[PDB]
Design a protein around this ligand. Structure first.
Ligand SMILES: *[C@@H]1O[C@H](CO)[C@@H](O)[C@H](O)[C@H]1NC(C)=O
Length: 49
């Protein structure tokens, strides 16, 4: 039922954005007026140092 998915930070394929207030995403529109179906991914900010 639940499948854990991993991906790498690559902008033209996986856009990664900081949240607005707390775990939420600003519903942006395309040039065709399509709201982009986003997802709440879990990632670190930078490397361990
Ligand atoms: C993540 O790192 C960037 C660069 O230092 C910083 O601007 C941002 O505030 C960090 N995220 C948080 C909320 O800790």
């Amino acid at each position: 039922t639940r499948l854990k998915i991993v991906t790498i930070h690559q902008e033209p394929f996986v856009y990664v954005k900081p949240t607005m207030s707390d775990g939420t995403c600003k519903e942006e529109f395309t040039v065709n007026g399509d709201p982009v179906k986003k997802v709440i991914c879990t990632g670190p900010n930078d490397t361990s140092p």
